[PDB]
Design an enzyme around this catalytic site. Sequence first.
Site, PDB file in Angstrom:
ATOM      1  CG  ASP A 183      -1.806   1.201   1.320  1.00  0.00           C
ATOM      2  OD1 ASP A 183      -1.941   1.905   0.305  1.00  0.00           O
ATOM      3  OD2 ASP A 183      -2.401   1.422   2.398  1.00  0.00           O
TER       4      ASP A 183
ATOM      5  CB  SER B 144      -2.046  14.253 -13.558  1.00  0.00           C
ATOM      6  OG  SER B 144      -2.461  13.995 -14.886  1.00  0.00           O
TER       7      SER B 144
END
Length: 330
Positions: free
Chosen positions: A35, A199
Amino acid sequence: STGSATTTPIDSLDDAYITPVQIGTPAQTLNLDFDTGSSDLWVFSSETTASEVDGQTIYTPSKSTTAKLLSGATWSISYGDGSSSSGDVYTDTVSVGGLTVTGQAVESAKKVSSSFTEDSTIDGLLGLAFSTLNTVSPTQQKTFFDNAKASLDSPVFTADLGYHAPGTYNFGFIDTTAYTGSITYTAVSTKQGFWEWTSTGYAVGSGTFKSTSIDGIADTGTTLLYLPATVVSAYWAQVSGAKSSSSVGGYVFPCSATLPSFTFGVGSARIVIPGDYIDFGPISTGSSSCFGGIQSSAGIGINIFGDVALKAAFVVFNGATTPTLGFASK
Protein backbone atom coordinates in the site's frame (compact mmCIF):
# COMPACT_ATOMS: atom_id res chain seq x y z
CA SER A 1 20.75 -5.84 -2.89
CA THR A 2 17.47 -6.20 -4.72
CA GLY A 3 14.15 -7.97 -4.33
CA SER A 4 11.46 -9.07 -6.79
CA ALA A 5 8.04 -10.48 -5.88
CA THR A 6 4.93 -11.32 -7.85
CA THR A 7 1.71 -9.56 -6.87
CA THR A 8 -1.63 -11.28 -7.63
CA PRO A 9 -5.19 -9.93 -7.79
CA ILE A 10 -7.38 -11.20 -4.92
CA ASP A 11 -10.44 -11.65 -7.16
CA SER A 12 -11.76 -11.38 -10.71
CA LEU A 13 -12.18 -7.59 -10.43
CA ASP A 14 -8.65 -6.69 -9.27
CA ASP A 15 -10.15 -5.30 -6.04
CA ALA A 16 -6.69 -5.52 -4.46
CA TYR A 17 -3.37 -7.30 -4.97
CA ILE A 18 -1.51 -9.61 -2.58
CA THR A 19 2.21 -10.24 -2.42
CA PRO A 20 3.84 -13.02 -0.37
CA VAL A 21 6.05 -11.80 2.49
CA GLN A 22 8.31 -13.93 4.72
CA ILE A 23 8.22 -12.95 8.42
CA GLY A 24 10.26 -14.51 11.20
CA THR A 25 12.50 -17.52 11.68
CA PRO A 26 11.60 -20.04 10.42
CA ALA A 27 9.74 -18.05 7.80
CA GLN A 28 6.01 -17.51 8.14
CA THR A 29 4.65 -16.50 4.74
CA LEU A 30 1.73 -14.08 4.78
CA ASN A 31 0.03 -12.49 1.76
CA LEU A 32 0.10 -8.74 2.26
CA ASP A 33 -1.52 -5.82 0.46
CA PHE A 34 1.34 -3.50 -0.57
CA ASP A 35 0.00 0.00 0.00
CA THR A 36 1.84 3.10 -1.25
CA GLY A 37 -0.83 5.18 0.52
CA SER A 38 0.06 4.14 4.09
CA SER A 39 3.12 3.43 6.20
CA ASP A 40 2.37 0.58 8.61
CA LEU A 41 3.28 -3.07 8.11
CA TRP A 42 0.58 -4.87 10.09
CA VAL A 43 -0.55 -8.47 10.15
CA PHE A 44 -3.26 -10.78 11.36
CA SER A 45 -1.66 -12.63 14.25
CA SER A 46 -2.01 -15.05 17.14
CA GLU A 47 -3.06 -11.94 19.12
CA THR A 48 -5.98 -11.00 16.84
CA THR A 49 -9.40 -11.30 18.50
CA ALA A 50 -10.52 -14.78 17.46
CA SER A 51 -13.98 -13.73 16.23
CA GLU A 52 -12.29 -11.24 13.89
CA VAL A 53 -10.21 -13.88 12.08
CA ASP A 54 -11.98 -15.69 9.22
CA GLY A 55 -9.58 -17.62 7.00
CA GLN A 56 -6.50 -15.37 7.13
CA THR A 57 -3.02 -16.74 7.69
CA ILE A 58 -1.70 -15.44 11.00
CA TYR A 59 1.75 -14.43 12.24
CA THR A 60 2.64 -16.14 15.54
CA PRO A 61 5.58 -14.28 17.06
CA SER A 62 6.10 -16.91 19.79
CA LYS A 63 7.09 -19.34 17.00
CA SER A 64 9.74 -16.99 15.58
CA THR A 65 13.19 -17.16 17.15
CA THR A 66 13.98 -13.67 15.85
CA ALA A 67 10.80 -11.96 17.09
CA LYS A 68 11.11 -9.44 19.92
CA LEU A 69 8.33 -7.46 21.57
CA LEU A 70 8.85 -3.74 21.01
CA SER A 71 8.03 -2.92 24.60
CA GLY A 72 5.34 -0.33 25.15
CA ALA A 73 4.68 0.29 21.45
CA THR A 74 1.12 0.35 20.13
CA TRP A 75 -0.44 1.28 16.80
CA SER A 76 -3.85 2.23 15.48
CA ILE A 77 -4.80 3.13 11.93
CA SER A 78 -7.88 4.21 10.04
CA TYR A 79 -8.04 4.06 6.26
CA GLY A 80 -9.86 6.20 3.71
CA ASP A 81 -12.47 3.50 3.17
CA GLY A 82 -13.45 3.57 6.84
CA SER A 83 -11.66 0.37 7.81
CA SER A 84 -9.30 0.19 10.77
CA SER A 85 -6.99 -1.99 12.84
CA SER A 86 -4.83 -1.70 15.95
CA GLY A 87 -2.53 -3.63 18.24
CA ASP A 88 1.02 -3.96 19.54
CA VAL A 89 4.42 -4.33 17.87
CA TYR A 90 7.25 -6.82 17.39
CA THR A 91 10.50 -6.47 15.53
CA ASP A 92 11.43 -9.39 13.31
CA THR A 93 13.14 -10.35 10.06
CA VAL A 94 11.04 -9.58 7.00
CA SER A 95 11.86 -10.63 3.43
CA VAL A 96 10.17 -9.65 0.18
CA GLY A 97 11.18 -11.39 -3.02
CA GLY A 98 14.62 -12.23 -1.67
CA LEU A 99 15.33 -8.84 -0.06
CA THR A 100 15.73 -9.10 3.71
CA VAL A 101 15.34 -6.48 6.43
CA THR A 102 16.27 -7.33 10.00
CA GLY A 103 14.62 -5.47 12.87
CA GLN A 104 11.53 -4.51 10.87
CA ALA A 105 8.56 -3.33 12.92
CA VAL A 106 5.80 -5.91 12.44
CA GLU A 107 2.58 -4.51 13.84
CA SER A 108 0.48 -7.31 15.30
CA ALA A 109 -3.27 -6.76 15.12
CA LYS A 110 -5.31 -7.23 18.26
CA LYS A 111 -8.41 -5.78 16.55
CA VAL A 112 -9.43 -5.40 12.91
CA SER A 113 -12.62 -3.94 11.44
CA SER A 114 -15.20 -6.03 9.66
CA SER A 115 -13.97 -5.36 6.12
CA PHE A 116 -10.63 -6.94 7.02
CA THR A 117 -12.24 -9.94 8.70
CA GLU A 118 -14.48 -10.47 5.68
CA ASP A 119 -11.55 -10.52 3.26
CA SER A 120 -9.97 -13.93 3.80
CA THR A 121 -7.33 -13.33 1.10
CA ILE A 122 -5.51 -10.40 2.77
CA ASP A 123 -3.32 -11.27 5.75
CA GLY A 124 -2.27 -7.67 6.42
CA LEU A 125 -0.80 -4.56 4.81
CA LEU A 126 2.73 -3.49 3.93
CA GLY A 127 2.91 0.27 3.81
CA LEU A 128 5.13 1.99 1.25
CA ALA A 129 4.27 5.67 1.77
CA PHE A 130 6.64 7.88 3.76
CA SER A 131 7.55 6.83 7.31
CA THR A 132 6.21 10.13 8.68
CA LEU A 133 2.72 8.55 8.42
CA ASN A 134 3.62 5.47 10.50
CA THR A 135 1.22 5.17 13.46
CA VAL A 136 3.41 3.43 16.05
CA SER A 137 3.50 5.23 19.38
CA PRO A 138 5.46 6.42 21.30
CA THR A 139 8.33 5.68 18.90
CA GLN A 140 7.42 6.00 15.22
CA GLN A 141 8.73 3.16 13.05
CA LYS A 142 10.16 2.97 9.54
CA THR A 143 8.64 1.26 6.52
CA PHE A 144 10.16 -1.82 4.95
CA PHE A 145 11.39 0.34 2.05
CA ASP A 146 12.95 2.93 4.33
CA ASN A 147 14.76 0.21 6.27
CA ALA A 148 15.96 -1.48 3.06
CA LYS A 149 16.92 1.68 1.21
CA ALA A 150 20.57 2.03 2.10
CA SER A 151 21.27 -1.60 1.15
CA LEU A 152 19.49 -1.39 -2.21
CA ASP A 153 21.46 -1.10 -5.45
CA SER A 154 19.33 1.98 -6.19
CA PRO A 155 16.91 3.63 -3.73
CA VAL A 156 13.76 2.75 -5.68
CA PHE A 157 10.88 0.34 -5.91
CA THR A 158 8.58 -0.27 -8.86
CA ALA A 159 4.96 -1.29 -9.19
CA ASP A 160 3.88 -3.23 -12.27
CA LEU A 161 0.30 -4.23 -11.58
CA GLY A 162 -1.57 -6.52 -13.96
CA TYR A 163 -5.05 -6.17 -15.43
CA HIS A 164 -6.86 -9.37 -14.40
CA ALA A 165 -3.37 -10.94 -14.16
CA PRO A 166 -0.34 -11.09 -11.86
CA GLY A 167 2.29 -8.38 -11.83
CA THR A 168 5.50 -7.46 -10.02
CA TYR A 169 6.95 -5.36 -7.21
CA ASN A 170 10.71 -4.84 -7.59
CA PHE A 171 13.02 -3.28 -5.01
CA GLY A 172 16.38 -1.72 -5.82
CA PHE A 173 16.37 -1.85 -9.63
CA ILE A 174 14.42 -0.82 -12.70
CA ASP A 175 13.63 -3.73 -15.04
CA THR A 176 14.16 -2.13 -18.44
CA THR A 177 12.35 -5.07 -20.12
CA ALA A 178 9.10 -4.39 -18.23
CA TYR A 179 7.97 -1.25 -20.08
CA THR A 180 7.85 0.27 -23.56
CA GLY A 181 9.32 3.59 -24.59
CA SER A 182 10.79 5.84 -21.92
CA ILE A 183 9.98 6.54 -18.28
CA THR A 184 8.77 10.07 -17.61
CA TYR A 185 9.67 11.36 -14.17
CA THR A 186 7.63 13.95 -12.30
CA ALA A 187 8.04 15.85 -9.02
CA VAL A 188 6.75 14.52 -5.70
CA SER A 189 5.63 16.42 -2.62
CA THR A 190 6.09 14.51 0.62
CA LYS A 191 4.33 17.21 2.69
CA GLN A 192 1.32 14.97 3.42
CA GLY A 193 3.41 11.76 3.67
CA PHE A 194 2.18 10.44 0.30
CA TRP A 195 3.65 9.92 -3.15
CA GLU A 196 1.86 13.09 -4.20
CA TRP A 197 2.33 14.47 -7.71
CA THR A 198 0.57 16.63 -10.31
CA SER A 199 -0.85 15.18 -13.50
CA THR A 200 -0.81 17.52 -16.47
CA GLY A 201 -4.33 16.69 -17.70
CA TYR A 202 -6.64 14.15 -19.25
CA ALA A 203 -8.55 12.93 -22.27
CA VAL A 204 -11.69 10.83 -22.60
CA GLY A 205 -11.61 8.22 -25.35
CA SER A 206 -10.38 9.68 -28.63
CA GLY A 207 -11.20 13.19 -27.43
CA THR A 208 -8.81 16.11 -27.25
CA PHE A 209 -6.44 16.35 -24.31
CA LYS A 210 -7.36 18.90 -21.65
CA SER A 211 -4.30 20.53 -20.10
CA THR A 212 -5.07 21.01 -16.42
CA SER A 213 -3.12 20.36 -13.21
CA ILE A 214 -4.49 17.52 -11.11
CA ASP A 215 -2.73 17.00 -7.79
CA GLY A 216 -3.12 13.50 -6.41
CA ILE A 217 -1.44 10.47 -4.87
CA ALA A 218 -0.09 7.27 -6.38
CA ASP A 219 -1.83 4.72 -4.18
CA THR A 220 -1.52 1.00 -4.83
CA GLY A 221 -3.80 0.30 -1.88
CA THR A 222 -6.82 2.04 -3.42
CA THR A 223 -8.76 0.07 -6.06
CA LEU A 224 -10.23 2.87 -8.15
CA LEU A 225 -9.29 6.18 -9.79
CA TYR A 226 -10.72 9.14 -7.83
CA LEU A 227 -10.63 12.48 -9.64
CA PRO A 228 -12.38 15.87 -9.47
CA ALA A 229 -16.10 15.85 -10.17
CA THR A 230 -15.65 17.90 -13.35
CA VAL A 231 -13.27 15.30 -14.84
CA VAL A 232 -15.41 12.35 -13.77
CA SER A 233 -18.59 13.90 -15.17
CA ALA A 234 -16.83 14.48 -18.51
CA TYR A 235 -15.84 10.79 -18.61
CA TRP A 236 -19.24 9.31 -17.77
CA ALA A 237 -21.07 11.70 -20.09
CA GLN A 238 -19.54 9.63 -22.91
CA VAL A 239 -21.30 6.45 -21.71
CA SER A 240 -24.99 6.19 -22.61
CA GLY A 241 -27.10 5.63 -19.54
CA ALA A 242 -24.32 6.24 -17.01
CA LYS A 243 -25.35 8.13 -13.89
CA SER A 244 -24.24 8.88 -10.37
CA SER A 245 -26.25 6.85 -7.89
CA SER A 246 -26.28 8.01 -4.28
CA SER A 247 -27.86 4.68 -3.25
CA VAL A 248 -25.03 2.67 -4.81
CA GLY A 249 -22.33 5.17 -3.85
CA GLY A 250 -20.99 6.42 -7.18
CA TYR A 251 -21.23 6.24 -10.94
CA VAL A 252 -22.89 3.21 -12.44
CA PHE A 253 -23.39 2.34 -16.07
CA PRO A 254 -25.31 -0.19 -18.17
CA CYS A 255 -23.42 -3.47 -18.24
CA SER A 256 -24.16 -3.54 -22.01
CA ALA A 257 -21.90 -0.50 -22.58
CA THR A 258 -18.53 -0.35 -24.23
CA LEU A 259 -16.43 1.98 -22.06
CA PRO A 260 -14.11 4.59 -23.56
CA SER A 261 -10.48 4.79 -22.51
CA PHE A 262 -9.19 7.46 -20.15
CA THR A 263 -5.82 9.16 -20.65
CA PHE A 264 -3.86 10.97 -17.95
CA GLY A 265 -0.84 13.19 -18.41
CA VAL A 266 2.58 12.76 -16.84
CA GLY A 267 4.53 15.80 -17.92
CA SER A 268 4.40 15.71 -21.73
CA ALA A 269 3.76 11.95 -21.71
CA ARG A 270 0.40 10.19 -21.70
CA ILE A 271 -0.81 7.01 -19.99
CA VAL A 272 -3.86 5.37 -21.54
CA ILE A 273 -6.24 3.38 -19.34
CA PRO A 274 -8.24 1.03 -21.60
CA GLY A 275 -12.00 1.14 -21.16
CA ASP A 276 -12.15 -2.42 -19.89
CA TYR A 277 -10.00 -1.42 -16.88
CA ILE A 278 -12.84 0.89 -15.79
CA ASP A 279 -15.44 -1.92 -15.55
CA PHE A 280 -16.01 -3.18 -11.99
CA GLY A 281 -18.92 -5.39 -12.90
CA PRO A 282 -22.49 -5.79 -11.64
CA ILE A 283 -23.34 -3.79 -8.54
CA SER A 284 -24.90 -6.98 -7.11
CA THR A 285 -24.99 -10.50 -8.51
CA GLY A 286 -27.14 -10.66 -11.65
CA SER A 287 -27.65 -6.91 -11.97
CA SER A 288 -27.41 -5.20 -15.33
CA SER A 289 -26.06 -2.07 -13.60
CA CYS A 290 -22.27 -2.05 -13.44
CA PHE A 291 -19.97 -0.10 -11.12
CA GLY A 292 -17.54 2.39 -12.60
CA GLY A 293 -13.81 2.43 -12.00
CA ILE A 294 -13.47 6.22 -12.23
CA GLN A 295 -15.23 7.98 -9.34
CA SER A 296 -15.39 11.47 -7.87
CA SER A 297 -12.89 12.47 -5.20
CA ALA A 298 -15.25 15.18 -3.94
CA GLY A 299 -15.43 14.82 -0.18
CA ILE A 300 -12.35 12.56 0.01
CA GLY A 301 -10.21 15.66 0.15
CA ILE A 302 -7.58 14.31 -2.23
CA ASN A 303 -7.38 12.85 -5.73
CA ILE A 304 -6.22 9.23 -5.82
CA PHE A 305 -4.45 7.49 -8.67
CA GLY A 306 -5.37 4.02 -7.47
CA ASP A 307 -4.96 0.66 -9.15
CA VAL A 308 -7.20 1.50 -12.13
CA ALA A 309 -4.64 4.11 -13.15
CA LEU A 310 -1.45 2.49 -11.92
CA LYS A 311 -2.04 -0.88 -13.59
CA ALA A 312 -1.95 0.89 -16.98
CA ALA A 313 1.68 1.87 -16.30
CA PHE A 314 5.06 0.76 -15.09
CA VAL A 315 5.54 3.00 -12.05
CA VAL A 316 8.83 3.97 -10.40
CA PHE A 317 8.77 5.13 -6.79
CA ASN A 318 12.12 6.89 -6.58
CA GLY A 319 13.16 7.31 -2.95
CA ALA A 320 16.30 9.31 -3.59
CA THR A 321 17.01 12.29 -1.33
CA THR A 322 14.55 14.25 -3.46
CA PRO A 323 11.87 11.69 -4.28
CA THR A 324 10.22 11.51 -7.70
CA LEU A 325 7.71 9.31 -9.53
CA GLY A 326 8.22 7.77 -12.96
CA PHE A 327 5.58 6.44 -15.35
CA ALA A 328 6.03 4.40 -18.53
CA SER A 329 3.58 2.67 -20.83
CA LYS A 330 3.87 -1.11 -21.02
